Amino acid sequence: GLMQFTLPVRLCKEIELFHFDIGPFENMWPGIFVYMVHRSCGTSCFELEKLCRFIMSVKKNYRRVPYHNWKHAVTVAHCMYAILQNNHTLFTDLERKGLLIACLCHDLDHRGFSNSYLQKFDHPLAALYSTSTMEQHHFSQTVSILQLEGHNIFSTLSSSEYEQVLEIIRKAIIATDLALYFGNRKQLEEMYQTGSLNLNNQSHRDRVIGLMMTACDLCSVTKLWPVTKLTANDIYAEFWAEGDEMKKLGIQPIPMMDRDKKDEVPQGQLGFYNAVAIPCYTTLTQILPPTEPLLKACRDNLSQWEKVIRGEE
Numbered sequence: 111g112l113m114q115f116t117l118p119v120r121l122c123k124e125i126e127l128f129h130f131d132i133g134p135f136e137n138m139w140p141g142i143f144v145y146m147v148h149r150s151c152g153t154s155c156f157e158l159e160k161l162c163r164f165i166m167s168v169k170k171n172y173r174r175v176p177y178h179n180w181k182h183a184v185t186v187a188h189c190m191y192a193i194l195q196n197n198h199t200l201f202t203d204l205e206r207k208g209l210l211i212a213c214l215c216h217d218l219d220h221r222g223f224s225n226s227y228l229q230k231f232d233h234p235l236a237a238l239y240s241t242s243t244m245e246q247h248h249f250s251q252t253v254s255i256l257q258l259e260g261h262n263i264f265s266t267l268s269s270s271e272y273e274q275v276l277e278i279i280r281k282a283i284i285a286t287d288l289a290l291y292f293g294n295r296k297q298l299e300e301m302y303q304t305g306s307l308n309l310n311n312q313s314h315r316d317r318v319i320g321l322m323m324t325a326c327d328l329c330s331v332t333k334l335w336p337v338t339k340l341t342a343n344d345i346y347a348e349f350w351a352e353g354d355e356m357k358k359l360g361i362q363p364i365p366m367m368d369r370d371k372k373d374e375v376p377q378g379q380l381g382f383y384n385a386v387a388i389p390c391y392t393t394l395t396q397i398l399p400p401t402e403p404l405l406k407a408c409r410d411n412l413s414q415w416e417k418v419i420r421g422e423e
């Protein structure tokens with residue numbers, strides 16, 4: 111009860127900022143997560159013994175892939191932490207609990223391959239789940255780990271609170287399917303401009319939580335340039351591996367995934383920032399004004415990719 115987590119001074123200060131990098135010391139990421147749950151939720155939200163056992167089972171069920179790994183899980187949870195802390199009064203006790211857990215679990219047991227690749231490979235998961243294939247798998251794994259003896263971090267919730275929190279986590283994890291983001295943001299855009307956005311409308315919260323999830327999922331574009339640039343290598347290492355696997359099925363991959371087209375990466379980053387990242391953080395800033403630093407950092411990195419193209423690096 112009276113046991114807090116405390117971080118070194120630089121981390122204690124920097125962890126509050128959106129652009130925080132969790133660092134290369136794997137062994138400190140669990141403490142970083144608990145620290146965030148305690149300041150975001152309360153020291154009382156979860157039994158520390160059960161939380162710590164949940165965290166380590168979740169870590170174990172992330173795989174050794176270049177990008178969709180344990181470090182991504184914690185990076186995405188930290189961004190959600192910064193959004194929740196800069197928007198104190200907007201979210202329920204249940205939402206704060208559910209969303210940090212949703213983020214930590216959002217890519218559980220990822221193999222480093224897109225939903226497309228599962229479908230063309232004809233992976234069993236593609237037969238079991240026709241849309242948002244990996245994302246329904248991630249939710250499935252989350253519920254599995256929650257049902258291990260000693261791992262029910264929600265045991266103190268009522269039968270109906272427990273159902274609301276698992277339903278927040280499910281919608282939250284499904285929303286990380288980037289195919290669903292485009293229409294989700296178009297609707298949020300229309301609702302905000304025509305003035306119909308209403309945060310007491312549950313179907314409207316759902317949409318806003320989904321955009322937060324896209325924003326946290328993409329947050330590597332909102333870091334300082336050297337973090338963003340080096341994460342971009344991790345992300346292309348998966349894409350090109352998937353491209354290789356497409357070629358093995360007798361299919362020319364999209365250029366994004368073709369390692370023979372490394373040269374077109376700077377232009378692909380531009381497309382991505384203009385088509386996905388910038389629009390995402392724009393609409394998010396409109397709905398949640400204190401998340402503007404994400405939009406600003408994103409624009410800064412777009413400007414850095416433009417410099418790469420002009421041969422200024």
Ligand SMILES: Cc1oc(-c2ccccc2)nc1CCn1cccc(C(=O)Nc2cncnc2)c1=O
Nearest residue numbers: 330331338341342345365366371374375378379382
């Ligand atoms: C459509 C297209 O075509 C090309 C292309 C084309 C020809 C030759 C080389 C690349 N790239 C893209 C977009 C690539 N893409 C798609 C999805 C997600 C990300 C992403 O989360 N990026 C990211 C970067 N740094 C930190 N965190 C995250 C991403 O970059």
Ligand SMILES: [Mg+2]
Nearest residue numbers: 216217244286
């Ligand atoms: Mg994912």
Ligand SMILES: [Zn+2]
Nearest residue numbers: 182216217327
């Ligand atoms: Zn992710």
